[PDB]
Amino acid sequence: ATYNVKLITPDGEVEFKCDDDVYVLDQAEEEGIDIPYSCRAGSCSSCAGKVVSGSIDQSDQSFLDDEQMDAGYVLTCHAYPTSDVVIETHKEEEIV
Numbered sequence: 001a002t003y004n005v006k007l008i009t010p011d012g013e014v015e016f017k018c019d020d021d022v023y024v025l026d027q028a029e030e031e032g033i034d035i036p037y038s039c040r041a042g043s044c045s046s047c048a049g050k051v052v053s054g055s056i057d058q059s060d061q062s063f064l065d066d067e068q069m070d071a072g073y074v075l076t077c078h079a080y081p082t083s084d085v086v087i088e089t090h091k092e093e094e095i096v
């Protein structure tokens with residue numbers, strides 16, 4: 001129910017409110033968050049962030065491996081915040 005998502009951006013963080021039923025992008029741009037997006041389809045080799053804490057559901061994309069997920073990564077186009085989550089954005093060239 002509308003959680004406090006942190007995006008640790010290079011800029012130096014953008015904490016924002018993200019609905020459990022919205023993507024961590026769609027509602028980010030609303031606050032003004034320029035995430036490193038390229039598309040919204042979910043068959044890419046870019047567009048990721050590092051899950052620091054909390055849990056979220058990205059069972060929608062088709063890119064990040066089990067390794068990357070477990071290792072602490074998430075796609076940044078198709079992700080639903082299930083609680084207060086902390087993630088770092090700009091992690092294309094940290095997962096590949």
Ligand code: FES
Pocket residue numbers: 037038039040041042043044046047076077078
């Ligand atoms: S840029 Fe294509 S799903 Fe993220």
